[PDB]
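Notebook entry, cofactor series.
This is the third protein in the set we're modelling with a bound small molecule. For this one the ligand is cladosporin. I'm keeping the input format identical across the series so the outputs can be compared line by line later. Sequence and SMILES below, as received.
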Amino acid sequence: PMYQVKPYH
Amino acid sequence: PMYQVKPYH
Amino acid sequence: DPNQYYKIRSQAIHQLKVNGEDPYPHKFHVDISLTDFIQKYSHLQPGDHLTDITLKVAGRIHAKRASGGKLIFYDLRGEGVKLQVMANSRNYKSEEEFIHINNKLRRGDIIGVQGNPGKTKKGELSIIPYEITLLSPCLHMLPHLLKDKETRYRQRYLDLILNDFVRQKFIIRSKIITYIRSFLDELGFLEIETPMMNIIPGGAVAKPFITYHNELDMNLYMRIATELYHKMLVVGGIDRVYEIGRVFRNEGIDLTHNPEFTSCEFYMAYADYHDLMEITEKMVSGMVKHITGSYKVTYHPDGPEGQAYDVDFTPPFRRINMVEELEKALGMKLPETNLFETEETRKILDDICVAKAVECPPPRTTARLLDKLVGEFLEVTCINPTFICDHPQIMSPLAKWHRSKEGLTERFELFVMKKEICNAYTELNDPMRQRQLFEEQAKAKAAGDDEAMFIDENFCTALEYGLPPTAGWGMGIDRVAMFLTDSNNIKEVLLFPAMKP
Amino acid sequence: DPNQYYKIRSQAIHQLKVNGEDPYPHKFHVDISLTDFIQKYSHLQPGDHLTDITLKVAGRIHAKRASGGKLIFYDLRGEGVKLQVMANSRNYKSEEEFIHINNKLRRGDIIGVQGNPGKTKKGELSIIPYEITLLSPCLHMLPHLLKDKETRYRQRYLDLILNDFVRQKFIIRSKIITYIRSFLDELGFLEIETPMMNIIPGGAVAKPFITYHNELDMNLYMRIATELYHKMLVVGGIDRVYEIGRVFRNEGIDLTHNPEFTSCEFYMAYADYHDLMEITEKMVSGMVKHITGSYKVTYHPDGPEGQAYDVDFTPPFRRINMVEELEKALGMKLPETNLFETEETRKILDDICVAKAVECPPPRTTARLLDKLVGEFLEVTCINPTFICDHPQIMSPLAKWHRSKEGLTERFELFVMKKEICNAYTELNDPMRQRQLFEEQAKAKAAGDDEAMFIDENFCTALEYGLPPTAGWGMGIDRVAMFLTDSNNIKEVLLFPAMKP
Ligand SMILES: C[C@H]1CCC[C@H](C[C@H]2Cc3cc(O)cc(O)c3C(=O)O2)O1
Ligand SMILES: C[C@H]1CCC[C@H](C[C@H]2Cc3cc(O)cc(O)c3C(=O)O2)O1
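Returned structure with ligand:
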């Protein structure tokens, strides 16, 4: 599982 | 205002 | 007679507009759609007439059946659903106007209807018109028995009018695309748009479309993929990107192929092909589950009259190693993966191919022999979604070399129903090695294969500023659509497919 | 010197490869994003070092500053934010590794960092590395300083790395597109894909791109608009459709124009241009408010050095009739709108154009004179979003005739900052009249210049099965992006814009 990045929208 | 149509999604 | 019907109807409508009765009105105000009209008034009992409720609806007449005299029935269709218009002379605004409007209308006509909700003694939900207005006439005789594919594809409006399952199919396609967009958006991807006209085509293997630009005296190519631009954007510091868009490959037209088709490519920094394998698993399984309500989908490869298979999208997907299991399926030992560019290895693959009766038309190369061999012994065993992994370097010029495996790369393809819906790999971020592989491709282009990749110096230059470890991914949208719509022909999931004269 | 730098660094990295230290590793596991790190640990007091917490992060080095014996500071950037890496040999794995890895690293390099959350005596949030890994080197010397626009546009990755506002611009663009999608989807529209390669180009007035299809052995045109296909799909019984896609018009490149640009077209059955005006108001105002926080947005037409105007997107938008307010702006009464196609009125407009000093290069025709006069006296009047309505039929071959006004059509254009972001009209559903107009302009094409549209027989044939009363709409996505990003150049809102050297 890849690290979490906040959605642009 | 136009009549409402349910979203395909 | 359909011709004569066209003539007559044309003349009728013509003198209608000559007489100023306006067969093509500008605006009709629709109070409620047919669907929630059905939802609202379905509870009515047979014989009910609600006189104090007046609604305006609109649609196309699919059938016209007279009970004779004072009563006439219209089949009004739209939104993939049905509503009966029961026109009774006594319930109309007046008998005269009733007569007049009824003699005017034909099957196929677009009409608005102002009337009361009700239900017939037969139990059919109906609307009883105060007035019927012709919104626009149909000048052609509408078909009776469109069961033939070519006519359906060339005129898509007829197919959509007569066939609901078509509408449902394209709805499914839209659902797929939107689902992918949501999935990637929520993972922190940025939806981007890259040039569809490039100086040098790249990112894939195919024959390009060529066009001319009327500002710059130069010729330009239509893109065969979005790969290089995306990777350049990852170099730019945008860590997660994706594009769902049109891609052009000029090639044969068949059941799985169209010259222009929609693909989705995403690129994820700090990810490798394993990560992308699991992300692919949950994306595909989740898509199938959300849309079809289940992980398992019935599919007919040969069509409705042929045998159906059950495709199980339940994760995790089966993983297979190309060379390894190819050795398993051949019952023979293949040369070590470091030796694959050797002409000796090419001869070995040749003898194996001729021994297994696997045809490989000229030019006969290690890569083509291997591709046909894999296609024969491996791809055919993929019914459920299946990962074919660790392709040799020769088959994957843009893929990063395998970390533990000499001569191979880190790459996978996702196969459903023996067809490839996905191509993804750990991206090669080494500029020197990339430029070298591009050199090999260039030499092979100037002698051998003509769809072979051209060296892109801008992209290598971009790699020289450095590319973080990154995994790329791509998916044919149309094929996924085929599999979720139960279609064996790509033309089914394309609104206006390319057709031969 | 930067060239010498490139050579030296290239040699060094290559020798790192020869020595087998792997300057381009396959996989680094990132535990947490820089953003999440920043906001999670921002609560730390200066001097804090958390030895219990070990995290892995990654990014690009924008600065390297040394206290110079045992202490080196890295400015680590990514995700539009920054994090300090404070590396002292005391906290490193060992002093030797510290020395080695620090001698290896340069500015611009992509690195992973394993270490602990902390804050310097100066109060800067930092991560104190247990180990630093080079994920990928930067072989080029980065600008100190990338102001020159040509360099920014030709290498976009450099612009994205060095300039933080670019990312925000394209984020805003993405937000616009996604917002439009959400809007139309929620209104019950179906997102569709129509051919980008056509036999006959149509839907607008532009010079087309021409390409060749191999298997079909014929020339095809790149689409200048999606209009006709959409209307044909409305004929098919799909009442509400929309497409956000690439459109190709081969023409001059300037601040407001690019050969390929993204447009959004939707078509709505049983609607007219009034309804679409209201919908446009709500969509645009809602978009601007949602993205920018309010209805008012500041825009610099001449750039940051020039004056800024306040654009008020507060609904309703101001409406003006073309002919009437042109008469009021000229201080002259124009001819009656039903006379607009005679040579006489054209001569009158010639006289008015020469009297008002409005230039119209040959050919001088009524349509182009009207366009120049409206452009001069009207389009400049629009700062806030403004509807210009009721265009003459001569300027609108695809628009339905105005119901109350003879010679005009039901049509509107939406203007923001003197520029046209939207074009919409009540669709002409009459096949005979449509084919007639088409044939007039085809007769112009035969009258000896190519501007005028080609006749589409398939589209008229589709209209003969009837088209329900329908309104239709289109929007330049790129221009809207320009106005919401405060850009006076379209190249700013395009990732890899077309360039003329
Ligand atoms: C971009 C790629 C990634 C792998 C799956 C899929 C392969 C692609 C091959 C391909 C080639 C072609 O010439 C025409 C087509 O319609 C397709 C297709 O639909 O699927 O999309
Ligand atoms: C599709 C239309 C609707 C009206 C506004 C806008 C006009 C369109 C014209 C146009 C022509 C062209 O050759 C290149 C371009 O970038 C544009 C554009 O951005 O805007 O979009």
